[PDB]
């Protein structure tokens, strides 16, 4: 049982996904991601289910490559609503995306709490995820 | 011949955000100039801005990865963002599909400078901001 998995479209794997995983590991956390890549066809709920069974939290990278998979509102609302051990466990991070793109392809996400790599450095993101982990697992 | 806005940009952004923002501003009654403001390595940011302001009220600059990876110097970027005309700041940066880490790596002086951001602001939000600004100074 580990700390975070990172679900992502393939286009984000070698850049923000790898960099975020590295930074979390350098902060004592166990983080995996490769098998949580989402390809056209893959089931978002199944991927999240596999991840949350092994890890405390799922990070989901909300990039254009992600939202253009045309997930349904239910798929997306269920994702952000997931709870485990008595708290929210899915952490969306907007990445190289416009609000207009979110509203076009994934409008249910437009209002849901998320980090945003245009506003938050990797260090800022790590500090936020640390604080959450500390508040829940100690 | 006068325009309300000119839009400076890297070529990578021309057919996407630049065209979309220009179209929305134009639909909302503004005159927008952007065909002469593609930026490339070796261009003088100061001379390009001088030229845009010679026939436009405001310059918009698209702060995307393609823009910042042209490696502008701090003096060039500080001079751009601080540019005033008729007693007020006239260069309007808009961050677009960029990370804060990329800004700190390639253009760190921009990290603390006031800007719109297309991950936070829809094109309609941007147009509303620019409409209110332009009206205040040019009605």
- Crossing angle of the two packed helices A18-25 and A122-137, in degrees rounded to 10: 50
Query: Which residue of B17, B100, B122 is in closest CB contact with A118?
Result: B100
What values do phi and psi take at B55, rounded to 5?
A: -145, 25
B24 bridge partner residues: none
Q: What does the CA dihedral B115, B117, B121, B122 come to, rounded to 10 degrees?
A: 120
Name the β-bridge partners of B7.
Answer: B60
Structure tokens at B49: 């801005």
Which of B100, B104, B122 lies closest to A119 in CB terms? B100
Method: X-ray
**A119 contact B CB<8A:** yes
Question: Hey, what are A116's tokens?
Answer: 């945003």
C-alpha span between B81 and B61 (Å, rounded) = 9
Residue identified by tokens 């006239």 is B90
Give the span between the Cα atoms of A74 and A31, in whole angstroms.
27
Distance CA B59, CA B96 (A): 16
N-terminal to C-terminal alpha carbon distance within chain B: 18
Backbone dihedral angles phi then psi of residue A94, each to the nearest 5 degrees: -75, 140
**CB-CB contact of A89 with A56 (8 Å):** yes
Tell me the catalytic residues of A: 75
Residue with tokens 């760190």: B108
A26/B28 Cα distance (integer angstroms) = 49
A96 contacts on B by Cβ (under 8 Å): 97-99
Residues of B in contact with A119 (CB under 8 A): 100, 117, 119-120
Test B100 with A120 for CB contact under 8 angstroms: yes
Q: What is the distance between the alpha carbons of residues B102 and A89, in angstroms, rounded to a whole number?
A: 28
Task: Label residue A85 left, alpha or beta by phi (over 0 means left) and psi (-120 to 50 means alpha).
Answer: left
């Amino acid at each position: 049982q580990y700390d975070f998995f990172i679900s992502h479209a393939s286009e984000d794997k070698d850049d923000i996904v790898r960099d975020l995983a590295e930074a979390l590991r350098n902060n004592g956390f166990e983080v995996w991601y490769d098998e949580f890549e989402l390809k056209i066809g893959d089931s978002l709920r199944k991927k999240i289910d596999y991840g949350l069974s092994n890890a405390n939290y799922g990070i989901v990278i909300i990039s254009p490559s992600f939202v253009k998979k045309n997930w349904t509102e239910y798929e997306l609302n269920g994702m952000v609503a997931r709870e485990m051990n008595g708290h929210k466990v899915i952490l969306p991070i907007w990445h190289k995306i416009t609000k207009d793109e979110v509203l076009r392809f994934s409008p249910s996400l437009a209002d849901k709490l998320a980090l945003n790599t245009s506003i938050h450095t990797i260090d800022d993101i790590v500090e936020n995820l640390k604080n959450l982990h500390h508040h829940h697992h100690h």
